[PDB]
Design a protein around this ligand. Structure first.
Ligand SMILES: C#CCN(C)Cc1nc([C@]2(O)CN[C@@H](c3nc(-c4ccc(Br)cc4)no3)C2)cs1
Length: 330
């Protein structure tokens, strides 16, 4: 089997991408944030504390003929921004882009933190990291991909995120029309539960390439590109007036600037992030200070190839017995 679904930016900055997911019978369609950096499929629901729901579409398990309480199971998760959610668990039929998993754990939120409430466009998350990170207790649950894997034509999914435009998540096949050149595959470590790999270096703008190993994770659920402070400083040093602002929480730059590209290495191949992809616009409405799309990982303990990087590429998440990541230009 295969599936194919369109993913759409939630706003004009590409802060996140949402993909429609069918849950239950009859289908209840919720728009979920596919997150290769976590492993829980959780939704706003009829159980979510009413004051914490503000415009989201909710899953109502009592209206699904295929829903079953996963008795005694609970879940609780926090994300890198400090947001969190928790609740109980149903199993139900879940379909993405025509690909169906029966008995998928659907984690129903009883509580969500303020950043989730405030984002009316995100109805929940669909985790696509390794199932060893799933938070359901006492019986850990598998991701949608892990459950689908054995049925897929090939044990892969691909992320083809757009820049200020929709893109595609495919399951079970590689769309050879969706990229240019070849896909370069690179080894993955699953030891931390992430799609963790080692970039071979970077370049700023038209500069020469610096060969240096950069461990990090491919994370569709993170907006920005978080890299070591040395690399990030070398990038922003090329932008007049750019500086790290403790009050804003990262590098800002004059909105009057044109930004240089940023290249990262994948083996002997290179992915070039256009400068415009690094512009996240005014820090507040009307400001002439703009927020940078490349930020230091120093406070977080891990480098993160988030959407800024991934949307410059066609990315293969190969979940074969030895997992690998593939990157192609597009
Ligand atoms: C600090 C620190 C150390 N590490 C915990 C950093 C890491 N963080 C991760 C994620 O938590 C998983 N994917 C990202 C993600 N964030 C979301 C999200 C959050 C809020 C809202 Br509102 C909507 C979506 N979805 O995915 C970040 C992996 S490693």
């Amino acid at each position: 089997s295969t599936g194919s679904a369109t993913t759409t930016p939630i706003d004009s900055l590409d802060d996140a991408y949402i993909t429609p997911v069918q849950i239950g019978t009859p289908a209840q369609t919720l728009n979920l944030d596919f997150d290769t950096g976590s492993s829980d499929l959780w939704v706003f629901s009829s159980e979510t504390t009413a004051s914490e729901v503000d415009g989201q579409t909710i899953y109502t398990p009592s209206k699904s003929t295929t829903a079953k309480l996963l008795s005694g199971a609970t879940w609780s998760i926090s994300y890198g921004d400090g947001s969190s959610s928790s609740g109980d668990v149903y199993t139900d039929t879940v379909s993405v882009g025509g690909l169906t998993v029966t008995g998928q754990a659907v984690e129903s939120a009883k509580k969500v933190s303020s950043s989730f409430t405030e984002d009316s466009t995100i109805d929940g998350l669909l985790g696509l990291a390794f199932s060893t990170l799933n938070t359901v207790s006492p019986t850990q649950q598998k991701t949608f991909f892990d459950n689908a894997k054995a049925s897929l034509d090939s044990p892969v999914f691909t992320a083809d995120l757009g820049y200020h435009a929709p893109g595609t998540y495919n399951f079970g096949f590689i769309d050879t029309t969706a990229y240019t050149g070849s896909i370069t595959y690179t080894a993955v470590s699953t030891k931390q539960g992430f799609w963790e790999w080692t970039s071979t270096g970077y370049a700023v703008g038209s500069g020469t390439f610096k060969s240096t190993s950069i461990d990090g994770i491919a994370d569709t659920g993170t907006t920005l590109l978080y890299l070591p402070a040395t690399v990030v400083s070398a990038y922003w040093a090329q932008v007049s007036g750019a500086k790290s602002s403790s009050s804003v929480g990262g590098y800002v730059f004059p909105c009057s600037a044109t930004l240089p590209s940023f290249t990262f290495g994948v083996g002997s191949a290179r992915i070039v992030i256009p400068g415009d992809y690094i512009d996240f616009g005014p820090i507040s409405t009307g400001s002439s200070s703009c927020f940078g799309g490349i930020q230091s990982s120093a406070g977080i303990g891990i480098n993160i190839f988030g959407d800024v990087a991934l949307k410059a590429a066609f990315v293969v998440f190969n979940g074969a017995t030895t997992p690998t990541l593939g990157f192609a230009s597009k």
